[PDB]
Symmetry: D3
Subunit: 244 residues, 6 copies
Amino acid sequence: MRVDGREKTELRHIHIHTNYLKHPEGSVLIEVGDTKVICSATIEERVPPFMRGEGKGWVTAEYAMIPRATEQRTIRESSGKVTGRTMEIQRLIGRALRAVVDLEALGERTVWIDCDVIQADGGTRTASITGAYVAMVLAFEKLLQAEKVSKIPVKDYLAATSVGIVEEQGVVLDLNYAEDSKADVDMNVIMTGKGQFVEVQGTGEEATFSRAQLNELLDAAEQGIFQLIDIQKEALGDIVSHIE
Amino acid sequence: MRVDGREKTELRHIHIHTNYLKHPEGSVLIEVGDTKVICSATIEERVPPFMRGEGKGWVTAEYAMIPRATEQRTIRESSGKVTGRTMEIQRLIGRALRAVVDLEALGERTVWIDCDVIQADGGTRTASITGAYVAMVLAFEKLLQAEKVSKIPVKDYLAATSVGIVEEQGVVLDLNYAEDSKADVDMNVIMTGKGQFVEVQGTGEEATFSRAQLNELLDAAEQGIFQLIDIQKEALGDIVSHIE
Amino acid sequence: MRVDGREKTELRHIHIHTNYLKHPEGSVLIEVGDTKVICSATIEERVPPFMRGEGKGWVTAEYAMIPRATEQRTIRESSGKVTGRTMEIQRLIGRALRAVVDLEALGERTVWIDCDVIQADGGTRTASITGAYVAMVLAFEKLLQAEKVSKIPVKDYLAATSVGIVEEQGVVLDLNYAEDSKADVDMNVIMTGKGQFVEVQGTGEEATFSRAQLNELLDAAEQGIFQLIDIQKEALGDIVSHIE
Amino acid sequence: MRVDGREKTELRHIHIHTNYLKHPEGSVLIEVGDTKVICSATIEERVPPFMRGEGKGWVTAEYAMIPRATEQRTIRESSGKVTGRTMEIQRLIGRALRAVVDLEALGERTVWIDCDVIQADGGTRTASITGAYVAMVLAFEKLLQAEKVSKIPVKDYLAATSVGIVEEQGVVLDLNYAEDSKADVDMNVIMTGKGQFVEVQGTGEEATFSRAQLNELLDAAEQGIFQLIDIQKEALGDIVSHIE
Amino acid sequence: MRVDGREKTELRHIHIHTNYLKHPEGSVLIEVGDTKVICSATIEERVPPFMRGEGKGWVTAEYAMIPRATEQRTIRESSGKVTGRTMEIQRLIGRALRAVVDLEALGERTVWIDCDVIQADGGTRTASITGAYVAMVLAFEKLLQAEKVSKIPVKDYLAATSVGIVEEQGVVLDLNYAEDSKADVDMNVIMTGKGQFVEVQGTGEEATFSRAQLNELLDAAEQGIFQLIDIQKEALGDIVSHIE
Amino acid sequence: MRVDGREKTELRHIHIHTNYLKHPEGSVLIEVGDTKVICSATIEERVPPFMRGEGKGWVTAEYAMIPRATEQRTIRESSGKVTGRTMEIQRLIGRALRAVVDLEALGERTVWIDCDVIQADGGTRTASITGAYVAMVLAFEKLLQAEKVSKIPVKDYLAATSVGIVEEQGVVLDLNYAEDSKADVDMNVIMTGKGQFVEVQGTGEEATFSRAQLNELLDAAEQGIFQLIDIQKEALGDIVSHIE
C-alpha cells in the first residue's frame, strides 16, 4: 500500500552522524541513501608557506573511496595512482568550504578535511561537502570552547547536491549511480543557507542542455539544498546558536 | 585618440592559425590576447579496452604549460608531478569535445587532443577547447578526404570562454590573469553554435554569487562564444560546407 | 564500585558487525576497543599469471588507515607514498588467510581482502586478520549458496592478537597504542581453532626477551585467540554449521 | 630549373626568432628545417645549496617534446615518465651552456633553460643548444641593462650541430630524422666562435668509425657551426657589441 | 668416502670478510653457502628530526639484490619499484641492530646500514643481519679510535639464522632457496650472545605449526646463532677485547 | 726505491675475474684500481615488441652503484629516484655492446647486462663496458656449447677508457675520481680490437678543448684500450679461439 520509490524532486534518506569517531576535532558519517562518507576535520596550527604571516587560515580537502565502496572493486589509490576524478573532487570540496569560512577569524591554521567514501551509490562529492561542512563546524565549536577563536568562523551554512536530466524521466534530484549512468545531463550545485551559490558545475554527457533546463535543474537543487541545510541544523543541535 | 583597453563585454584579440605545424592530423595555434595554445589532434585506429568492439570512437585530451608560459616560472610536470589543475582541465576538454562528436560516425578510433600552452595570461582551458575544436575538425576533414568517414562527424560547432565578476568592475568577459586573480566569481562556459550548453562551471572565490548573477554571466558568455564560433568559421574556410 | 580498567590478560571489548556494507561479497566492521577496521572480501574469477591453469585460488590483502584514524593525523598513502609498515602488514594478512584456505577447493579465483582502518588505537594488523577471516567466510558462504564451491573452503577458524611486555606491568594481552608505545617487547600471534600457529612475530624494542617470556607471551595469546574465535563463531551464526 | 635538395655539407634553413614570447627574460623560437624548438631563459636569484655562498652562478636545462612534435605521437612525459633520452639531452644542454658562461660574473643566480620541441625532424638537441644560447644572451642583455651584471657574462659564442655517415651518401651535415635513422654513424658537436670544442659525442650505430672519419665529421661540423654562429650574430643585432 | 651434504642441524659454510671495501666506516662481505651479501656501515653526524636534540643515535637499514643475484633474473628496484619484501626486510634489519646498540653512547649520529645481496640462495635477510652487525662494530671501532665514543656502543653480540620444517626432512637449520621453497614452515630468529631474543618470526606456509615445533625450531636456531657468533668473534680479531 | 704513482699515460691495475658468481650466464668482477664493478650477462629468449619476429637480438644495459661505493654515501636509486647520470650511462653501455654484437647471429634473444658498482673511484662507466664485454662473451660461450648459436656472435673485441686534461698535468689516461674532479676536459672512448671507434664522448668542463687536444686524447685512449683488450684476452683464456 505504501508508495514505492522516490519522487523526481525527492532526496534519498539523509542521516548525519556527529562525533562519529573519537580522534578528529570534528567527525561525521553522512549517509545519503546507499552513499556513505566518513568526513573528518583536523586542525593544524600552520598554514601553507605561500600565505604564512598574512594572518589568514586555509581549508584543504582530500578524498578517497575504499576499494569495495563500489559494486565493482576499484584499484586502490595507494601511491596505484591518484585519478583525475579524485583530484577534481578534492579541488571542489576545498574551494566550496573555503568560500564559507571567515579565514581571518580562523586565524593562521589549516583545516584538513578528509572524505573517505565507505559506500558509493552516486553523489559522493556533494555528500562529502554536506558532511564535511558539519565536521568542520564541530571542529570550530571545539576551537571556540578552547577560546582559540571568538566565534564559529563561518559566514553561512553550506550544502550540496546533484541534479540531472535522466532518460525517460526528465529533471531528477539527488541521483544514484544507476541514474547518473543513464543521465544525459548531470550537475553539482553548492549553495548557502541564504540561497547564494558557491559552485555550479553542469555537464552534458554526450548531449547538451538549454538555458531553460539549467534554470530548472538549479531550481530543483536549491530546494534539495535548503532541505539538506535543515538536516545539518538538526544534526548540529545547540551549536546552531553559535552561528548567525 | 583611440580608446585604450577593452569594454566589459569584449573579447581579447582572437586569432586561430590552422595547419600550424606539419605532423598532426589537425594543428592549430590559438591566440586569445596574450594567451597562446598549440592544439593538435591525432587520430589513432584504436579505442580503449572498456569500449572495444562497440563500434564507437573516443576523444581524450592532454594539457600542459611550458615552464615559462607564465610570468613566474612553473615547475615542469615531467614525471615533477601532474597537478590537480591539469587533471581537471584535461577532463573538461575531453568531456566538452566528446559531447559534440558523433562517436558512431567517427567509428572505432580515438582522437588524441594535445593542448600545450606556450604563453598563459588567463583563459587557457577555454582557449584550449576553442582551438582544439578546430584542430579536431581539421583532422576530421583529412579523414573525410581519405574516405575513412562519410561526413565530418560533428553535431555542431563548439567554443568556450571565461566570464567573471571582478572587483570594482562587475560582470566582465574573457578574463586575463590579473583580472581573474582579483575576481570574486569566475566561470567557464562551453556552448554550441545552436546556443546549447555542454559545460557550465562557476566558482565563488572566497565569495558567493546569486542566481541573477549566474544568468548575467551566462548571457555574456553566450555572445562571446557566438563570436568565437564566427572566428572558428573564419579559420575553417571551405570546410564549413562539410558541416551542417 | 565497578572495577575500572582491564586485567593484564583481558581483551578489550570485541564486536564483529557482519554484512556491514552492501557491495562486497563479505563485509565486516570489527571493533577491538577503540580500534576499528572495515574488512571486505571481494571475489574475482581470476588468479595471478604465475599460477594460472593450476586450478588453485589465491588470497591477497591490502591495508590502509584513513588519515585521522590516528590521534595525530597521518599523511595519506595516496599514490603520498606506501609505507614499509603498510607493506609488511599486507604481507602478514595475506599469508595468514592463505594458510587457512583450501585453495584447491576455492578453485581458480582470488579473494581480495581490504582492511581499512577508520580508528586506530593499537592492534590494527591483528584486528584486521580477525575481521577479515569473518568477511572471507561470509563471502565463501555466498559462493556455496551459488553452488560455485562444494563447501566453505576453510581448513579451520583463524584469529589474531597482540601481546607485549610493558613497563611496570609485565606480560599484557591486546595492547592499546599507549601500551605498545611503552612496550619493551611486543608480539603478533595468529592461531587456528585447533591451537595451531600460522604466524608468530615477536620483537624486542630496544630490549630483548628470554625464551621463558616467549612461552609466557604465547600462552596468553592462545587464550585471547580462543576467545576471539568464540566471538567469530557468535558473529557467524548458522554459517558455523557449514564449517568443520 | 632550381637545384632540388641540399648538398652533403649544407645546413637546412635556419631561422632564429628573438623576443619570441613575452614572459621569459630571454625567448627564442629556433627553426632548423622542420625542427622547431621554443627556447627560454629564466633568471632566478638563487643557486643550488651545493654551491651557495661561493659567489658563482649556475645554468640548468630542461627538455621536452610536445606529443605530436613527432610524426608518430609520443607518450607525454607528464609525471608518463622521464626517458633516458630526455635526461641525457638535458645534461648535454646544461653542460654546454655552462662551459661558455662566466659564472663568477653572472653572480649567484641560476639560468633556467627550457627547450620545448614543437616540431621534431632530427637535430633537436643541437638545435636546442643553438637557440638556447641566444635566449640566454637575450636574458644577459636584460641583466646588463638592469645593472645587475657589468658585462654580458659569456666567454664566447656557442652553437651546435649534428653530423653523420649515411648509407650511400657518406659524410653529411645536419641530419633530418629520415637521414639519422639510416645513419651508420652520428655525432653531436658543440663549438665556440674561436673554433674550440665544448662537447663532442660520436656513436657508431651497429657499426664503427675510423679516426679518419672522426676528423672528417668534425671538419664538416666546424663549418656548419661557424655558419650557425654567423646566424646567431644576425639574430642578436646590436647585442653583439656587448660581447667580445 | 667423505660424507656428502649437510646434517639437518648444520649451517652452510660461513665466511665473514672484514674491511672488504675501502670507503665505508665498516665493510663486510658475508658468505653463507652460496648466499653472499655486501654489508656496509656508514656513520652520519645527524639523526632524524623526530628525535633531534634528544642525545640518542639511530640505526637504519637498506636492502637490495643485484638483478642476477638470483637464478631467475629479478627486475631492478630502480625507482622499477620497491617491493614489500624489501620493505619488510629493511624494517627487520634496522629493528634488530637498534636493539643491541647503546643509542645514548652512540650519541646523536645515525648508522646507515646497507645490505646488497650479490648472490642469493636463501637466508639473505638473516645473513644480512649477521654481516651487518660486524660491519657496524668495525665502524664503532673506528669511532672509538677517533675518540668520538668512549666504548664500542653495543650491548651484546647479535646474529641471525633461518630454520624451517621441510617436506620429508622435518626440522632443518639454515635453509637454502630450494629447501625454503618446499618448506611447510619457515622462521627467522635473531639472538644475542647471552641467548636472548631480539626478533622471532615464524610463518606457516599453506600449513601450520604446533608449539612443540616452535620450541624445536627455536632450539635449533639458538645453537646455529651461537656458532655464528663464534664466527663473528673469529672475524673481529682483537676488537672483541673492546666489547664486554 | 720503487717509483711511486703512475705515469701520465699509464692505466691503473686492471684485473678481470671471470665466472665470478654462479647464477648469470656470464659473470665478471672488473677491478680498475679502486674502481670495482660486478658485470653480469643474462640471456632471455625474447626481444622487445618493436622488433619481434624480425630475427635479430638485442642488448640492454642497467647500471647502479651500491650506496657506499663512493667516499660520500649516495642516496639509493630504490624506486629514491633514477638519476640522469645513471640513464646516460645505461644508454652508453647498451649502445656500445650492441655495436659489436652480430645481432642476427645472436638470434631473437636479449642480453641483459647488469653493471653494479661496488667501489667507485672514477671510470665506472668505461670499466663497466670493459667488464661487461667479457661477461657477455662468457655468456655467448655457454650458448655456443649449448648449440644455440653457431659462433660467438661478436664482430670484434671491445673495451673502453677515460682520458682527460688535468690541471698542471696535461693529458692523462684512466682518471681516478680526484683527477676527474680537477679535470678541465674529460673524455670516454670506446674502441674495438681493430682500432675502430664505437663511441667518443668529450666534454669541456667549464672550459674548452682544441682539435689538437682531441687528437692527443684519442691517441692516448687507443693504446689504453689496446692494453685493456690484451687483458680481456688474458681473462678469456681458450675462448679467444672461438673469436676471429
